[PDB]
Amino acid sequence: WEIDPKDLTFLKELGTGGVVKYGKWRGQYDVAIKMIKEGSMSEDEFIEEAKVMMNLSHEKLVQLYGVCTRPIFIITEYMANGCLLNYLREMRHRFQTQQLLEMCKDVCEAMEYLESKQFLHRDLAARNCLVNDQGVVKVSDFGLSRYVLDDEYTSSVGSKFPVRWSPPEVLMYSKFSSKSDIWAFGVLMWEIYSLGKMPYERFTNSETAEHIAQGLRLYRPHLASEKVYTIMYSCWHEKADERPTFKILLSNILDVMDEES
Numbered sequence: 001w002e003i004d005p006k007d008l009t010f011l012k013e014l015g016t017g018g019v020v021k022y023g024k025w026r027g028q029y030d031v032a033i034k035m036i037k038e039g040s041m042s043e044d045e046f047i048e049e050a051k052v053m054m055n056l057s058h059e060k061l062v063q064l065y066g067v068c069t070r071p072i073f074i075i076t077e078y079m080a081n082g083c084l085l086n087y088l089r090e091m092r093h094r095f096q097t098q099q100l101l102e103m104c105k106d107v108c109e110a111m112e113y114l115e116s117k118q119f120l121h122r123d124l125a126a127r128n129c130l131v132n133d134q135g136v137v138k139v140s141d142f143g144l145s146r147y148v149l150d151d152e153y154t155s156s157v158g159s160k161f162p163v164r165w166s167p168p169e170v171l172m173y174s175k176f177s178s179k180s181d182i183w184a185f186g187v188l189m190w191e192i193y194s195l196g197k198m199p200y201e202r203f204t205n206s207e208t209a210e211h212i213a214q215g216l217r218l219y220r221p222h223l224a225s226e227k228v229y230t231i232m233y234s235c236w237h238e239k240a241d242e243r244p245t246f247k248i249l250l251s252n253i254l255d256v257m258d259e260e261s
């Protein structure tokens, strides 16, 4: 469960927000080293659950290799093409919709696995997915929000809360469940088919919440076929119990993949 930090070679910085670096493990294996900002996380709680998130293995989940326990380190799978949000916004890729659908299926596969384990992501969004050197999308930082201490992010009334990815029952009552992950998944499909535009682009968070409370929704990205739009729209039913499962969403996505080509 614990990785010896002396086995790490740091090679390049990948981002600061704490700090993420590219490096090697025992000379050979590529890794991401996440160096957590002091005071930013409930580290004891994180460490205890870290023991659980490593048994969470799936080809479409960014793999947790271990932790170093200042700053403590989270060592994970390295994803050469970075976060899905920036990849989507690189217009040079000139994606086909078949590739976009495959991105959606990648995430849906990961989320069905998490569902089968009764594990919530709680912050699913394109900014929390990564792309590897082969172009496969995997979902990262699942469950992480439970241990972030910043209160602009903890609470539904927070300036950093994922308002645009939250169902009505989350915005009004903080009711989290599998179906708030389902809702967020549908917004993620919208992000993917919109090549990474911000959901509810011309609205504030507060306008977005009123719009959702009123029963109005995101509409169809240009690159989305009717059958793809139907899939994402189904994640946004006002009644949580009316929303599909990730198993059902996976079948719907597989069906459309067949029908395109």
Ligand SMILES: O=C(CNc1cccc(Cl)c1)N[C@@H]1CCCN(c2ncnc3[nH]ccc23)C1
Pocket (backbone or CB within 6 Å): 014, 015, 016, 018, 019, 020, 032, 034, 035, 036, 037, 062, 074, 076, 077, 078, 079, 080, 081, 082, 083, 130, 140, 141, 144
């Ligand atoms: O990992 C995050 C944010 N989450 C986070 C969570 C806990 C602690 C810390 Cl410090 C950060 N961002 C980085 C930015 C740079 C590009 N990234 C990667 N590139 C390439 N491979 C990779 N593997 C994992 C991340 C990764 C994502």
